[PDB]
C-alpha cells in the first residue's frame, strides 16, 4: 500500500510497511526554516536510535523487559486487535521511562563488550 | 551528572556519561546559518566515524596499534590520573595520523571481508 495506508491496519500487519513511511521523511525564509527543522528532527530520531544500539534497523529487539504495568494486555490482543494509533495512546505516559531504560541497557552492553574483547 | 559534568572527572570515569554529551549536539538569517553549520558538522563527525567501521557506537575498538611515540604514559596514568581536557592537549599533534591509520585499516578490513564472503 502507499504512505500511511496501514494506519488503520493492525500492528502485526502495519509493521510490514515500515519502509514506506521511513522513505517519506526526507522526500522564502519560512520554508527554508521548515526544511532545516525537519532535518534536525530526523537526525534527532536517528541519534536516539543510535544510542540504543539500533543503527541501520527498522525493527530492533532490545534486552529491556516489559514491566506489565505499562500495558498488561495479552500479546495477541496488542498485535492482532490494535492499531498503532491506539497503542501510541495507551502507553503515551510511559515512553520516557522506556527510552531511559533502553539508553542504560545500551551503555551496559557497550561497556561489557569493550571488556569482553580484552581477553587476549 | 548533567551536561559536561564529567569535564573534571578522570577519563575512566568521564567515559561513563558519553551519552549525556552526545544528546546535546542536536538539541534571523544568522541563526539559520548557525543551525545549518551545526548540522553539517554533526554529519561530518558521523561520516568520519562511519568510514572507520564505527557506526552506531559511542565506544568503538579498532585494530590500529598504539605507537608509543604519541604518548608513552602507563595505561593506568592515562585512565585514572588524567582528564579528557588534558589528554586532548597531550596528543593534539597526532590526531591526523591516527585518523589516517584508522581509515586505512577500515579499508583493508572491508576488502578482506568482501573476499572472505566469496568462499562459496
Amino acid at each position, epitope marked *: 500500500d502507499g504512505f500511511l495506508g496501514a494506519a488503520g491496519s493492525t500492528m502485526g500487519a502495519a509493521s510490514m510497511t515500515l519502509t514506506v513511511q521511513a522513505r517519506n521523511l526526507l522526500s522564502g525564509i519560512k520554508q527554508l526554516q521548515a526544511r532545516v527543522l525537519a532535518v534536525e528532527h530526523y537526525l534527532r530520531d536517528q541519534q536516539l536510535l543510535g544510542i540504543w544500539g539500533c543503527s541501520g534497523k527498522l525493527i530492533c529487539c532490545t534486552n529491556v523487559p516489559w514491566n506489565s504495568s505499562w500495558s498488561n494486555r495479552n500479546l495477541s490482543e496488542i498485535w492482532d486487535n490494535m492499531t498503532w494509533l491506539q497503542w501510541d495512546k495507551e502507553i503515551s505516559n510511559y515512553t520516557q521511562i522506556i527510552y531511559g531504560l533502553l539508553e542504560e541497557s545500551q551503555n*551496559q552492553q557497550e*561497556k561489557n563488550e569493550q*571488556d569482553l*574483547l*580484552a*581477553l*587476549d | 551528572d548533567g551536561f559536561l559534568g564529567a569535564a573534571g572527572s578522570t577519563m*575512566g570515569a568521564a567515559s561513563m556519561t558519553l551519552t549525556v554529551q552526545a544528546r546535546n549536539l542536536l538539541s534571523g538569517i544568522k541563526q539559520l546559518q548557525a543551525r545549518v553549520l551545526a548540522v553539517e558538522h554533526y554529519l561530518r563527525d558521523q561520516q568520519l566515524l562511519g568510514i572507520w567501521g564505527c557506526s552506531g557506537k559511542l565506544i568503538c575498538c579498532t585494530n590500529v596499534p598504539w605507537n608509543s611515540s604519541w604518548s608513552n604514559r602507563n595505561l*593506568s596514568e592515562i*585512565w585514572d590520573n588524567m582528564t579528557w581536557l588534558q589528554w586532548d592537549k597531550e596528543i593534539s599533534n597526532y590526531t591526523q595520523i591516527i585518523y589516517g591509520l584508522l581509515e586505512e585499516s577500515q579499508n583493508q578490513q572491508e576488502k578482506n571481508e568482501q573476499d572472505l564472503l566469496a568462499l562459496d
Partner: antibody, heavy 123, light 106 residues
Framework: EVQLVETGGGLVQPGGSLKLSCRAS????????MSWVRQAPGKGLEWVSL????????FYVDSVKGRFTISRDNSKNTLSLQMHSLRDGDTAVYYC??????????????????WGQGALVTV | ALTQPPSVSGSPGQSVTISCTGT?????????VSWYQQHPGKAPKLMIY???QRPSGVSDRFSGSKSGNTASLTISGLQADDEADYYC???????????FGGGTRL
C-alpha cells in the same frame, strides 16, 4: 591488609544445593575481578569460575557450566556462588581469589592476586 | 593441565628449578604464566606473575623464565621454611581461562 573471609556450608548429598559466600576487606571491592578456585582434598588446584568487577560477565569451567551460578554485590562487598547437584566428585576446598581479569582500561592481570583460606564442601 | 615434576628437593643453601610444560596453544602462546606457593594446610600465595615478574613483598630468591613451551621457577638460597607445594598456572584463551598443573613438593 587485604582479607577474604569464606562463610560456606558443610555436607550435602547429591541432588541438593549449597551456597558459598565471601566477604572482602582491605581494598576497593568493585575495582577487581574475582573468581573461585577448587582443590579436591588429595589433588591440585583447578579454576572453577570467574566474575568481572561489575558482575556482568561470568565464565565457568566446562564441568560446571550447567550447575553453578556466580554473582557479586558491590555494595555489600560480597561474592557468592550457588552450586547445584553437588556430586561426589565435587568434594573440595573452594577458595575465593582476587585477580584473573581486568576491565580493558586497567593493566593486564591474568593471575590470582589475593587468596582466602577456603570453605570445605563435602558430599 | 600442565606437567610438573612430582618432587624437587635439595639441601639448604643450594638452588633448584621447578619446570612447567604445556603445549603451543596455551603456555607457548600467551605470556601469562604464574606460580603459587601453597604451604600444607594453607591457601596458596602468589610468587610470580606475568612470566618473570615478582609481586612486591616476595623475596628476591624467587625468579623464573620461559622458553618455548617450558616455564621454570628458580628458587635460590634454599631455606628450611620454603617447604611448600608449588604450582604453575597459565592463561589458555577465552574458552579455557586457566589451566593448572599438578603440585610439586619442595
Amino acid at each position: 591488609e587485604v582479607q577474604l573471609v569464606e562463610t560456606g556450608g558443610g555436607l550435602v548429598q547429591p541432588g541438593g544445593s549449597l551456597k558459598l559466600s565471601c566477604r572482602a576487606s582491605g581494598y576497593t571491592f568493585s575495582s577487581f575481578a574475582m573468581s573461585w578456585v577448587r582443590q579436591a582434598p588429595g589433588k591440585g588446584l583447578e579454576w572453577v569460575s570467574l566474575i568481572n568487577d561489575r558482575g556482568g560477565l561470568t565464565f565457568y569451567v566446562d564441568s560446571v557450566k550447567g550447575r553453578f551460578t556466580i554473582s557479586r554485590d558491590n555494595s555489600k562487598n560480597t561474592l557468592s556462588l550457588q552450586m547445584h547437584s553437588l556430586r561426589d566428585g565435587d568434594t573440595a576446598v573452594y577458595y575465593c581469589a582476587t585477580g584473573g581479569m581486568s576491565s580493558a582500561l586497567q593493566s593486564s592481570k591474568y593471575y590470582f592476586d589475593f587468596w582466602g583460606q577456603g570453605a570445605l564442601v563435602t558430599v | 593441565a600442565l606437567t610438573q615434576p612430582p618432587s624437587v628437593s635439595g639441601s639448604p643453601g643450594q638452588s633448584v628449578t621447578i619446570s612447567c610444560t604445556g603445549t603451543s596453544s596455551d603456555i607457548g602462546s600467551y605470556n601469562y604464566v604464574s606460580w603459587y606457593q601453597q604451604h600444607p594446610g594453607k591457601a596458596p600465595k602468589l610468587m610470580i606473575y606475568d612470566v618473570t615478574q615478582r609481586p612486591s613483598g616476595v623475596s628476591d630468591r624467587f625468579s623464573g623464565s620461559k622458553s618455548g613451551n617450558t616455564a621454570s621457577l628458580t628458587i635460590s638460597g634454599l631455606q628450611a621454611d620454603d617447604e611448600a607445594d608449588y604450582y604453575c598456572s597459565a592463561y589458555a584463551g577465552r574458552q579455557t581461562f586457566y589451566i593448572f598443573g599438578g603440585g610439586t613438593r619442595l
